[PDB]
Every structure is written in structure tokens, then in C-alpha cells.
Design a protein around this ligand. Structure first.
Ligand code: LM3
Ligand code: GG5
Ligand code: GG5
Length: 339
């Protein structure tokens, strides 16, 4: 067991191993707080996240377990992974805090773009990387569900990593129309919709669908891609949703070539394949990587898939101490990567 030291940064108490030095606050969210630090063992700048109230309830306890299990499984260049996970506790009985450590990333895509058009080479490279990560995540039967610029970490070398996947600027702006409609059987291509929205924004410098609420969001979407055709209407079970949808003034799909005129025609073609209303007809991450737009980056021998990921715990109804003990087990069993 390493030697820990304690300090207060903002209102939060940080108790970490002495290997981590020079902690300085970087951000805060509902799920936890983050500090930048220097890892003396590796010479790397790292980000350290202290989870907030991880075992306050069964809900929080299961979430904490879900997050740790997911992060321990993600091992890919374009997905955030773990360098370390620790707790100051020396036994299960005093286990109350969980800290996660990863490579410090400089900014998010939102901050990077702020707020102009990127060059076509940068769009190619950033989107390629999102898709490469997404192929990996999807191969493990994981749906991200909340892909947006603020969940994409990017360094000054344009290296990109997907953050907080499978843990489920307004989020609704990047959400698939079937999610606005509350379809309970949406699939992994909801993530491809989000990528299409991100890509459009990198090309134009403007949010593609800046909806003010869920109904407005769906309206803006249909304005561009058109109201649903016959084949898609057949797939909608809900009578109320069909009545609503069929009662909108019908609109044809816009010509993407004109909407995004000036962009690389290959980028336009790919956007057309990503922003398809019927999710069953959207391009997959694997297919997208093979699209001619990424000719300069695609290497089928270096776009790996993930090891199988067991999410059976999601259907379990356990006690708060049981989720806590499983989490403790996952902390103790952690093996750091080669480095
Ligand atoms: C913007 N969000 C939601 C972030 C951003 C970061 C982050 C990551 C790397 N560099 C800077 C900030 C982390 C985060 C921060 C610290 C450790 C983490 C460990 C695993 C996963 C995420 C971690 N968590 N959430
Ligand atoms: F964005 C959305 C989300 C949900 C709906 C919807 N599903 N079933 C019924 C409705 C609906 C919503 C508003 N007005 C009439 C009907 C309509 C639009
Ligand atoms: F207006 C719309 C917008 C999107 C959808 C949609 N696209 N892919 C799947 C669906 C869908 C939505 C509701 N129920 C089944 C399927 C259906 C109607």
C-alpha cells in the first residue's frame, strides 16, 4: 500500500498516493470532481477524478460499479481508459471513496473548435478517430448514447479520445430522432447520428440541429432529412406517435450537396449515410471507416475490436453493500497497463 497525503481543493477533500503531485482543480460535474496532477512514477501528466457520493444509495452504488467496470474494460487509443484506480481505505468496512486516473487531455472538441470551421484534413482525422473508437465500443455491444463535443477529449496534436461511454451546449442537439420519440428499442446507430451532427458542425462552424426542446429538436431534424417515408412509418408501434408524425406537414429530404456546398463532396456523401432518419439504414462505424473520405487514415489492420463485455449485472437487483463490495473487488483486482 502506498503512502497517502490529504489536502483540500475547493470544498473537496483529496486523499491520494504521494506518487501523484501538484494537484490543481480542472473541472466539476454531478458524477465527480477532477484535478490535474504529475505522476512521479511515470513522468506523465494525469487527470484524477474523485467520484461523488459513490455509495450513497443503491442507484449510486450500481452506477459506480458500472463506471469502474466499463473503464477497466476500455483499452483502445481513442477511448478514455484507466492508468490507475485507488481508494485510501485499507479494508471494505472503511471503503467510502473511489479515485480514477487517466492521461491528462488538454481540451474537449467544443473548446478546440470554438468556434470556427476546421480544415478538411482536421475533420477527416477527428471524425476518423471518433469512428475508430466507436467501432471498438460497439463491438463490445456497448452503446455510448451521449456523444457530443464536450465528451470528446482532444490534445494539441489532434489526438482524440471518447469520454463517459455507456454511462446511461445541450445534449439533445446531438441526439437521434428516435430517442426524441422515446423509442425503447433504439440501437447502436444512435451514436452514428451523433457523429453526423458533430461532423456537420466541424465542417460548418454551426450546430446542425439546435433544438430548444425535444419537439423542436425533432422538427429541425425532419426539416433537413424530411418526414418519414412509408417503410419507416410501418415500424412505429405507437398510435399517438404515428398520429403526431403523419399530421405534420410533409417535407422532402433536402439536397445535402446544397446544404453543405463547399465541403469535400466525400464528406457530404458520408454525412448523407450517417444522418438517415431510419436507423436500420444508417451506416455502421465499421462501414464508415472504410468510406473513401478516410482514405488517408484507414488501415483495416489497425481498427481493432474489443474483448467481450458482460453487462449481465445491469439486470440484477442487489443491496447497497453488495454493489459496494463488487466495486471494492474491482478496485483491488485492477492491473495497470504496461506504460
Ligand atoms: C468532461 N468530462 C465529463 C470528463 C473529463 C475527464 C478528463 C479526462 C482526461 N483529462 C482531462 C479531463 C474525466 C476524467 C478525469 C480524471 C480521470 C478520469 C478517469 C477516467 C475517466 C475520466 C476521467 N472525466 N470526465
Ligand atoms: F418529439 C416528440 C416526442 C414524442 C412525440 C409523441 N409521441 N407520442 C405522442 C406524441 C405527441 C407529442 C406532442 N403532441 C402530440 C403527440 C412527438 C414528438
Ligand atoms: F419521425 C421519426 C423519426 C425517427 C424515427 C425512427 N428512426 N429510426 C427508428 C425510428 C423509430 C421511431 C419510433 N419507433 C420505432 C422506430 C421514426 C419517426
Amino acid at each position: 500500500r502506498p503512502t497517502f497525503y490529504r489536502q483540500e481543493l475547493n470544498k473537496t477533500i483529496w486523499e491520494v498516493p504521494e506518487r501523484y503531485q501538484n494537484l490543481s482543480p480542472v473541472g466539476s460535474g454531478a458524477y465527480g470532481s477532477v484535478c490535474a496532477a504529475f505522476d512521479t512514477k511515470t513522468g506523465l501528466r494525469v487527470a484524477v477524478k474523485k467520484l461523488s457520493r459513490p455509495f450513497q444509495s443503491i442507484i449510486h452504488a450500481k452506477r459506480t460499479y458500472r463506471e469502474l467496470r466499463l473503464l477497466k474494460h476500455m483499452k483502445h487509443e481513442n477511448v478514455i481508459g484507466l492508468l490507475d484506480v485507488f481508494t485510501p481505505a485499507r479494508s471494505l468496512e472503511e471503503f467510502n471513496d473511489v479515485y480514477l486516473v487517466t492521461h491528462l487531455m488538454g481540451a474537449d472538441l467544443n473548446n478546440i473548435v470554438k468556434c470556427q470551421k476546421l480544415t478538411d484534413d482536421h475533420v477527416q482525422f477527428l471524425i476518423y478517430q471518433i469512428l475508430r473508437g466507436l467501432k471498438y465500443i460497439h463491438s463490445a455491444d456497448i452503446i455510448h448514447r451521449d456523444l457530443k463535443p464536450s465528451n470528446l477529449a482532444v490534445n494539441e496534436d489532434c489526438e482524440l479520445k471518447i469520454l463517459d461511454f455507456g454511462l446511461a451546449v445541450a445534449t439533445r442537439w446531438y441526439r437521434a430522432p428516435e430517442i426524441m420519440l422515446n423509442w425503447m428499442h433504439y440501437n447502436q446507430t444512435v451514436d452514428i447520428w451523433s457523429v453526423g451532427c458533430i461532423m456537420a458542425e466541424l465542417l460548418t462552424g454551426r450546430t446542425l440541429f439546435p433544438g430548444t426542446d425535444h419537439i423542436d429538436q425533432l422538427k429541425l431534424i425532419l426539416r433537413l432529412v424530411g418526414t418519414p417515408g412509408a417503410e419507416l412509418l410501418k415500424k412505429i408501434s405507437s398510435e399517438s406517435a404515428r398520429n403526431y408524425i403523419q399530421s405534420l406537414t410533409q417535407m422532402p429530404k433536402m439536397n445535402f450537396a446544397n446544404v453543405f456546398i463547399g465541403a469535400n463532396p466525400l464528406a457530404v456523401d458520408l454525412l448523407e449515410k450517417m444522418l438517415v432518419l431510419d436507423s436500420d439504414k444508417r451506416i455502421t462505424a465499421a462501414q464508415a471507416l472504410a468510406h473513401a473520405y478516410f482514405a488517408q487514415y484507414h488501415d483495416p489492420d489497425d481498427e481493432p475490436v474489443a474483448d467481450p463485455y458482460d453487462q449481465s449485472f445491469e439486470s440484477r437487483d442487489l443491496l447497497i453493500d453488495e454493489w459496494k463490495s463488487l466495486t471494492y473487488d474491482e478496485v483491488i483486482s485492477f492491473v495497470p497497463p504496461p506504460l
